[PDB]
Design a protein around this nucleic acid. Sequence first.
DNA 1: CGCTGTGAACGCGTTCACAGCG
DNA 2: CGCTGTGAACGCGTTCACAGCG
Lengths: 206, 204
Amino acid sequence: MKVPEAAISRLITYLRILEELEAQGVHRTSSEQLGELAQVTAFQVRKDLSYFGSYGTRGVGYTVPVLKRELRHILGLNRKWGLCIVGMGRLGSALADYPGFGESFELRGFFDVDPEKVGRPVRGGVIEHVDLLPQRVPGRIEIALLTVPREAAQKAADLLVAAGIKGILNFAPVVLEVPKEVAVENVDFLAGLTRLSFAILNPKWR
Amino acid sequence: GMKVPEAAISRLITYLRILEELEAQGVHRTSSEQLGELAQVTAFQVRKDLSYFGSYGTGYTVPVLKRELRHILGLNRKWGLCIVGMGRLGSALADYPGFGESFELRGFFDVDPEKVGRPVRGGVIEHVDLLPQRVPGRIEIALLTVPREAAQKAADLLVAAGIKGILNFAPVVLEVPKEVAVENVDFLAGLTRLSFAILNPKWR
DNA sequence: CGCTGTGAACGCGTTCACAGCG
DNA sequence: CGCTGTGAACGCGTTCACAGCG
Ligand SMILES: NC(=O)c1ccc[n+]([C@@H]2O[C@H](COP(=O)([O-])OP(=O)(O)OC[C@H]3O[C@@H](n4cnc5c(N)ncnc54)[C@H](O)[C@@H]3O)[C@@H](O)[C@H]2O)c1
């Protein structure tokens, strides 16, 4: 009834497997196959899905197109979120060019404070100054991709919170302080690297 | 209890960053209470995570904890890294000036005939076919930044070449031998999690 | 007194056995 | 019968209780 956040991550993985199975022409799957491809047990797959509903067919398995649609629904992918990039350095510029956001995420703003950058035309847009967030965010942008230097993150975050942002995808190696009403999700490649260090040094534990 | 939760390692990483900051600020003494607040966990959490490895307290001396942590995390050595897939993300990573002294880029690989032989910061792009002749004793960690459809195969080549750890930036679940460590940095997953979080605020 | 270190209790996510239905 | 759906046990990871000690 109450969903652990570890399950949401696994649902994201199941949906990717379903998109792949569909691409391969597979119309039907099972908790066992789904588990095998996601490297989790069939038990876990069925438990994860049960948190939201009964999308399978007893004694048969799951119809790929159906589970796919249901998972996209649960995940909020059945809509078009408005996004923006704050910090047009190398990562931000790379993201503006990323051809993989799909139909669920649409870039609508690119902000920064550098005179050189501000004003530069980019894929589907043109860089603007951050103070224009209050006059660009409301009703148009729900999620912000935060790609500024570590020391500028928390600052940029406050400007986003005050601008009425709904969520922050944080790429900066720092814990952000935001009001509980604002969602934050971190993408930390340095932490990932350090975890590999620990893992490699502790094979037994791994 | 000596079965260190993987979730503790992530927090240790955060404690270290907090200590770096504190040291930068000129702070010398800290406590599990101040550390906790800064990491947004309880004082109980901090002390418990540290206890897994030892008794470094007295509170804590910023410089002493910082040293003990980067040691526990293996940051007291120079890891050899390589980038496989020199596209937009790969190139950005090659020029990132924030790896630190603990991580050294020693290889850049690709299959694009037009990128191989291409000079880059601290080296030149080589064909992935050269991995078996480049990884052993020089490169332990590979940053995997090739397209989704190419990731599993590239990981197979890195494994065969002797890689010890793979930092996977592709949205796929990699299959690798038990002895090869894998860590995912998945921004599309983070995006989708935010989507879910925004639609389920009560769920928090 | 104030703060650490750590067994033990506890709540929650995973595992499991089977109930439910096709 | 076969595979999904699920209530409950299990056990891992966080919280708690107190012991040590300057
Ligand atoms: N572009 C971005 O902003 C961005 C941001 C985050 C995550 N990513 C992820 O990064 C990965 C790469 O995306 P990109 O936009 O940089 O792609 P890209 O196509 O720019 O570059 C991928 C590079 O990999 C090379 N490649 C393909 N197969 C290879 C193989 N077997 N061995 C070695 N090199 C190979 C390609 O030739 C290309 O140079 C994807 O998984 C994507 O999801 C991209």
